[PDB]
Write a protein that binds this ligand. Structure first.
Ligand code: HEM
Ligand code: CA
Ligand code: CA
Length: 306
């Protein structure tokens, strides 16, 4: 069983070291908090939160960094290396990369203005990386609501609250133009923009992402508060201003009978959202962890101990 007090004796300063690292990084890179939260999400959805995503290529297995959902998208790896080194200095061979990334994600949310809580700890590091599983398990922005639900259920998160609350991670961070081009100019081969996208916002997005333009250009997930972790993400959905298809479907999908009331509840109360986010975050953080003597306490998050 994972427990929040796992390192209270072996490394009481772990959370503070993680926090300090993120605070320093945020000065030069204001997007790092969002990036780190996403790394934890992509770690947990592939064989569980086992730091498998942090592993680099080997001649025996490919890195998850080359998965469609990670390649030229996932970032912050050097920052994780930095805090790991700092933690290894303070507490040699004690804190796993899996736990480190989980704490990093929580501290990132808190630093961005979100809720503060102690995440369960005790996870251990994987002995391999899973590229094929990452390609299969990571959800895509073009997924329909049924597909999004399927993706979450596939890894162990059955609740619509899990999906709606965790999607709130898009209350900050960036998204490439490439992922919304269809919504803007030719949605589902209709030759028309996605009808669930507010027409005024449509114009704004088209200006940021012109047809035949730079597909790697970045746009804010939350037009209200781009870098603050708050419930504004849901207010946007209510006005048909979710950025990607997967965001707006939580409110507009024909299959959203169960998700609409959740979107409204989170848009109506910060407390309700934050409570749900922490609950869902801990559930995601409890996905098939290696514990006890299983796996290792990786010294270098990029490679398995030898
Ligand atoms: C429900 C399905 C989800 C889909 C389809 C999805 C899709 C995406 C896409 C397309 C991007 C843009 C990547 C890029 O342009 O490089 C992204 C970014 C992001 N996602 Fe998600 N996401 C989902 C769920 C989540 C969850 C559960 C979290 C965390 C709790 C999360 C947190 C983030 C953050 C913070 C960013 C910004 C990262 C950065 O700016 O570096 N996402 N997501
Ligand atoms: Ca993983
Ligand atoms: Ca926000």
């Amino acid at each position: 069983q994972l427990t929040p007090t796992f390192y209270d004796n072996s490394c009481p300063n772990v959370s503070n070291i993680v926090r300090d690292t993120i605070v320093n990084e945020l000065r030069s890179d204001p997007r790092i908090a969002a990036s780190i939260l996403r790394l934890h999400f992509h770690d947990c959805f592939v064989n569980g939160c086992d730091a498998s995503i942090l592993l680099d290529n080997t001649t025996s297995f490919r890195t998850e960094k080359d998965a469609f959902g990670n390649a030229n998208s996932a970032r912050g790896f050097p920052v994780i290396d930095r805090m790991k080194a700092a933690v290894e200095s303070a507490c040699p061979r004690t804190v796993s990369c899996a736990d480190l990334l989980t704490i990093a994600a929580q501290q990132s949310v808190t630093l961005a203005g979100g809720p503060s809580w102690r995440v369960p700890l005790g996870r251990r590091d994987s002995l391999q990386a899973f590229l094929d599983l990452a390609n299969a398990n990571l959800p895509a922005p073009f997924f329909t609501l049924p597909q999004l639900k399927d993706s979450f259920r596939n890894v162990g998160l059955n609740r619509s609250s899990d999906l709606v609350a965790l999607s709130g991670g898009h209350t900050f961070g960036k998204n490439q133009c490439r992922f919304i081009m269809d919504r803007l100019y030719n949605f589902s081969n209709t030759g028309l923009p996605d009808p669930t996208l507010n027409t005024t916002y449509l114009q704004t997005l088209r200006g940021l992402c012109p047809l035949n333009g730079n597909l790697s250009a970045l746009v804010d997930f939350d037009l209200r508060t781009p870098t603050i972790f708050d419930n504004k993400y849901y207010v946007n959905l209510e006005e048909q201003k979710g950025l990607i298809q997967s965001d707006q479907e939580l409110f507009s999908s024909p299959n959203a009978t169960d998700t609409i009331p959740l979107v409204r509840s989170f848009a109506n109360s910060t407390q309700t959202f934050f409570n749900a986010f922490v609950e869902a975050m801990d559930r995601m953080g409890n996905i098939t962890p290696l514990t006890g003597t299983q796996g290792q306490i990786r010294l270098n998050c990029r490679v398995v101990n030898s």
